[PDB]
């Protein structure tokens, strides 16, 4: 339920919606909101099912900005799963 | 005499020598002749306070076990109480290896009761040392996995009776459960049929935000528990939450909140556990 009055469960619901989401724009909005209301902690490690080839993992995670690297990581992983 | 016996026992324990075999036999013979439970308990305590943290022993351990058995043969309620107190006072190295070495039904029951009392006192005092002593006692009881269901049932019955100390007793039980892995999960689920829930709700009504946090932690632990019969616990929780079968509306709301919290926690452990490391078994 929305507005849980608890940041932890709010983050849990938000990342659940992130996993469920398929629109890149909505994924971006959810992830940027998460980054804003949390610390500078990487959030691509929120659904272990997500996979990324080891060849491209170095380049994809070799971005200074946590927000941008997480966005690109999630986008490519979700799109590869869809493919 | 006692000092010499203790020195011989310590020497045997440290260096595995046979020079203390005859001394141990003579000490055992003298102790049976004395028939002094207090004397035997004191002799065992001296051999474990400092003669048990140096090195493991076999002949000395057997002599100490025989002395403890002689002490416990009689009633000796006071001796057992002082003996349990000396063990908690000197929890050095093999304190549990000595206190739990009795392996007797009555001794184990008394030790469990003393450990429960110590844990309750530690929870009330909110003292780190007391909490550590209570945890050590709980771990010692767990290694002697002979019969803990009666003690757990007695503790649960005592906790629901009160309302002021009920919250503290529940918090202490939940904390020991987090380390004991909730062995009697089925027993814990079964006892709270109709009136235990109401009593616990009344007791927790006097709790505070600390009580709410303790309840959330206990819900997380329970979600990471209930291996033997998880379906029964899940059905009991759902009937009292969605079916509105709870005796109290506050109880039903708490059940719904606990279900949501457990679902969120499982989802965190389920997905955000990490892709690199292996999964955590639920």
Write the DSSP string, B30-81. HHHHHT-HHHHHHHHHHHHHTSSSS---SHHHHHHHHHHHHHHHS--HHHHH
The two tokens of residue B146 are: 């002979």
Within 10 angstroms of residue B86's Cβ, the number of other Cβ atoms is 18
Test A48 with B267 for CB contact under 8 angstroms.
Answer: no
Q: Where are the alpha helices (DSSP H) in chain A?
A: 7-20, 24-37, 54-61, 66-82
Return the C-alpha torsion angle B158, B159, B162, B167, nearest 10. 160
Distance in angstroms (rounded) separating the CA atoms of residues B260 and B252: 12
Test B272 with A16 for CB contact under 8 angstroms.
Answer: no
A12 contacts in chain B (CB < 8 Å): 264, 267-268
Question: How many contacts (CB atoms, under 8 Å) link A and B?
Answer: 30
Distance in angstroms (rounded) separating the CA atoms of residues B153 and B140: 18
Q: What are phi and psi of B18, to 5 degrees?
A: -90, 5
B268 contacts in chain A (CB < 8 Å): 12
Please state, in angstroms and as integers, the Cα–Cα distance from residue B46 to each residue in B38, B103, B107, B188, following that order.
12, 20, 19, 39
Nearest residue on chain A to B278, judged by CA atoms?
Answer: A48
Q: Where are the alpha helices (DSSP H) in chain B?
A: 2-14, 21-34, 37-49, 59-73, 77-84, 86-89, 95-98, 105-125, 128-141, 149-161, 165-180, 185-189, 195-205, 209-223, 230-241, 249-271
A50 contacts in chain B (CB < 8 Å): 275
CB crowding B165-186: b at 16 or more within 10 Å, else e: bbbbbbbbbbbbbbebebbbbb
The two tokens of residue B183 are: 């062995």
Mutate to test the interface with A, among B253, B267, B282 (most CBs of A within 10 A): B267
Q: Helices B128-141 & B105-125, crossing angle to 10 degrees?
A: 160
Residues B19 and B11 sit within 8 Å (Cβ to Cβ)? yes
What residues contact residue B142 under an 8 Å CB cut-off, 6+ apart? B148, B179, B180, B183
Distance in angstroms (rounded) separating the CA atoms of residues B20 and B9: 7
Within 10 angstroms of residue A80's Cβ, the number of other Cβ atoms is 13
Helix (H) or strand (E) holding A41: none
What residues contact residue B28 under an 8 Å CB cut-off, 6+ apart? B63, B66, B67, B70
Test B264 with A9 for CB contact under 8 angstroms.
Answer: yes
- CA max distance for chain B: 73
What residues contact residue B210 under an 8 Å CB cut-off, 6+ apart? none
CB crowding B206-238: b at 16 or more within 10 Å, else e: ebeeebeebbbebbbbbbbbbeeebeebeebbe
Test A15 with B264 for CB contact under 8 angstroms.
Answer: no
Distance in angstroms (rounded) separating the CA atoms of residues B184 and B172: 16
Nearest residue on chain A to B256, judged by CA atoms?
Answer: A1
Distance in angstroms (rounded) separating the CA atoms of residues A31 and A25: 10
The two tokens of residue B87 are: 């063990």
Distance in angstroms (rounded) separating the CA atoms of residues B30 and B170: 47
Q: Which of B131, B132, B105 is nearest to B120 (CA)?
A: B131
A19 contacts in chain B (CB < 8 Å): 271
Exposure of B9 by Cβ count < 10 A (0-12 exposed, 13-18 middle, 19+ buried)? buried
Mutate to test the interface with B, among A11, A42, A47 (most CBs of B within 10 A): A47
Please state, in angstroms and as integers, the Cα–Cα distance from residue A73 to each residue in A57, A68, B199, following that order.
9, 8, 51
B209 contacts in chain A (CB < 8 Å): none
Exposure of A22 by Cβ count < 10 A (0-12 exposed, 13-18 middle, 19+ buried)? exposed
B241 contacts in chain A (CB < 8 Å): none
Distance in angstroms (rounded) separating the CA atoms of residues B90 and B35: 25
Mutate to test the interface with B, among A45, A50, A57 (most CBs of B within 10 A): A45
Q: Cα B184 to the chain's mean position, in Å?
A: 13
């Amino acid at each position: 339920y929305d507005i849980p009055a608890s940041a932890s469960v709010n983050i849990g619901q938000l990342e659940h919606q992130l996993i469920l989401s398929v629109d890149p724009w909505r994924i971006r909005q959810i992830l940027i909101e998460l980054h804003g209301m949390t610390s500078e902690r990487q959030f691509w490690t929120v659904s272990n099912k997500w996979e990324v080839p080891s060849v491209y993992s170095g380049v994809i995670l070799g971005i200074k900005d946590n927000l941008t690297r997480d966005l690109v990581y999630i986008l490519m992983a979700k799109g590869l799963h869809c493919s | 005499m006692d000092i010499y016996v203790q020195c011989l026992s310590a020497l045997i324990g440290s260096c595995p020598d046979a020079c203390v075999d005859a001394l141990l036999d003579t000490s055992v013979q003298h102790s049976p002749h004395f028939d002094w439970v207090v004397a035997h308990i004191g002799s065992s305590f001296p051999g474990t306070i400092i003669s048990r943290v140096l090195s493991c022993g076999l002949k000395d351990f057997c002599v100490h076990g025989g002395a403890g058995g002689g002490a416990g043969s009689s009633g000796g309620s006071s001796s057992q109480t002082p003996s349990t107190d000396p063990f908690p006072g000197s929890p050095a190295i093999p304190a549990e290896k000595r206190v739990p070495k009795i392996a007797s039904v009555v001794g184990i029951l008394g030790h469990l009761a003393s450990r429960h009392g110590d844990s309750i006192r530690r929870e009330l005092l909110r003292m780190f040392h007391d909490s550590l002593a209570g945890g050590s006692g709980g771990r010692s009881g767990d290694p002697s996995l002979q019969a803990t269901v009666p003690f757990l049932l007695q503790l649960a019955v005592m906790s629901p009776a009160l309302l002021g100390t009920v919250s503290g007793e529940l918090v202490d039980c939940l904390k020991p459960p987090a380390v004991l892995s909730q062995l009697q999960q089925h027993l814990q689920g079964f006892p709270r049929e109709e009136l235990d829930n109401m009593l616990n709700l009344a007791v927790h009504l006097v709790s505070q935000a600390s009580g709410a946090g303790a309840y959330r932690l206990l819900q997380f632990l329970v979600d990471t528990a209930m291996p033997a019969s998880v379906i029964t616990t899940q059905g009991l929780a759902v009937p009292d939450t969605v079916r509105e079968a709870c005796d109290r509306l506050i109880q039903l709301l708490l059940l719904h909140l606990q279900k949501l919290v457990h679902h969120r926690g499982g989802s965190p452990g389920e997905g955000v556990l990490g892709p690199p490391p292996p999964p955590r078994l639920v």
